[PDB]
Amino acid sequence: SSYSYDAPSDFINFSSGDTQNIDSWFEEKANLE
Amino acid sequence: KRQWALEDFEIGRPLGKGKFGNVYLAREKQSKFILALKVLFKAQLEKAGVEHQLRREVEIQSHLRHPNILRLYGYFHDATRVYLILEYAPLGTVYRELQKLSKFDEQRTATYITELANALSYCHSKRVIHRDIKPENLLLGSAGELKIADFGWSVHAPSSRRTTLCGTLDYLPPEMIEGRMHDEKVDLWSLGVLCYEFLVGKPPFEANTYQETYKRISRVEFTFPDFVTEGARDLISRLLKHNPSQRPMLREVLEHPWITANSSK
Numbered sequence: 237s238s239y240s241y242d243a244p245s246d247f248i249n250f251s252s253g254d255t256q257n258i259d260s261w262f263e264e265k266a267n268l269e
Numbered sequence: 270k271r272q273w274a275l276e277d278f279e280i281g282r283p284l285g286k287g288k289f290g291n292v293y294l295a296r297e298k299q300s301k302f303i304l305a306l307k308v309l310f311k312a313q314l315e316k317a318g319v320e321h322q323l324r325r326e327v328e329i330q331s332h333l334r335h336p337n338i339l340r341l342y343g344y345f346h347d348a349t350r351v352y353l354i355l356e357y358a359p360l361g362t363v364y365r366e367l368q369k370l371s372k373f374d375e376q377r378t379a380t381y382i383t384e385l386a387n388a389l390s391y392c393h394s395k396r397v398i399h400r401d402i403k404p405e406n407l408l409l410g411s412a413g414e415l416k417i418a419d420f421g422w423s424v425h426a427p428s429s430r431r432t433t434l435c436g437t438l439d440y441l442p443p444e445m446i447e448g449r450m451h452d453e454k455v456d457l458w459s460l461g462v463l464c465y466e467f468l469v470g471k472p473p474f475e476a477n478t479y480q481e482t483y484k485r486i487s488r489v490e491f492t493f494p495d496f497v498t499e500g501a502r503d504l505i506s507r508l509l510k511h512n513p514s515q516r517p518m519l520r521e522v523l524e525h526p527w528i529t530a531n532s533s534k
């Protein structure tokens with residue numbers, strides 16, 4: 237299928253509380269005209 | 270950018286039996302960072318017709334950033350499987366704690382309720398309705414803090430009200446039972462059901478047959494055991510209103526005098 241999601245699949249360096257922008261995704265998706 | 274690959278993980282034991290047999294203790298190989306790794310098989314998803322539900326769940330929960338909401342750090346897939354890379358919560362499910370303890374004292378319940386209201390408050394600021402609040406969908410981290418874990422029925426409702434009957438029998442709001450449209454106030458209902466199960470050990474509308482539970486939820490037919498204190502009754506009664514419009518705001522829950530008198534620093 238499309239197992240292609242509007243979602244994170246990039247490798248994360250876990251070995252290092254604010255990545256603030258990320259949830260902006262909701263209002264932007266609502267703001268879609 | 271570099272994408273996840275299975276090879277990036279060491280896999281340990283299943284975290285759970287039964288319906289959770291599916292989620293493993295996992296380790297990212299370089300960082301040694303411990304994760305839960307949920308494995309789903311594509312073909313069984315696609316035969317079931319639930320793959321679009323999955324999309325929605327991942328999209329929602331991977332964009333939510335809160336202390337009391339389990340991180341979904343990311344996902345990836347291969348020829349046969351989809352993998353969800355989730356926060357590991359070492360103290361297990363609230364539901365297990367209830368099983369172990371029978372019922373919770375007032376301090377613990379108010380603390381759980383505070384933590385949870387804070388999570389749904391934040392969820393609602395995003396136009397997300399959870400729609401499956403119940404003890405198994407709740408996990409405990411290191412410090413015993415509550416985290417919301419299962420977003421399998423959650424929806425982003427930015428404008429339009431919802432028609433989808435979903436959730437768990439004993440937790441269904443009346444507006445769903447009656448086949449009316451629903452909004453974010455469903456989460457307030459289930460919150461009241463939960464606060465009741467916390468203190469009593471069983472949910473308020475439990476019946477032998479689902480037919481009979483539906484009916485009691487619609488008529489809001491329930492009673493409290495003598496041990497339930499007046500402030501706990503008031504709160505539960507406020508949350509458990511047939512008219513969703515009558516249910517309090519989450520800020521009101523957070524400011525309720527039983528909640529304030531009983532939750533921690």
Ligand SMILES: Cc1cc(Nc2cc(N3CCN(C)CC3)nc(Sc3ccc(NC(=O)C4CC4)cc3)n2)[nH]n1
Nearest residue numbers: 284285289292305355356357358359360361362418419
């Ligand atoms: C995802 C996840 C799970 C955890 N932690 C645990 C921990 C756990 N333990 C069993 C009991 N002892 C007391 C210790 C902890 N048992 C389960 S069994 C279990 C497995 C999965 C889920 N929930 C989900 O998969 C949610 C995402 C949909 C609930 C319980 N999960 N941290 N992160």
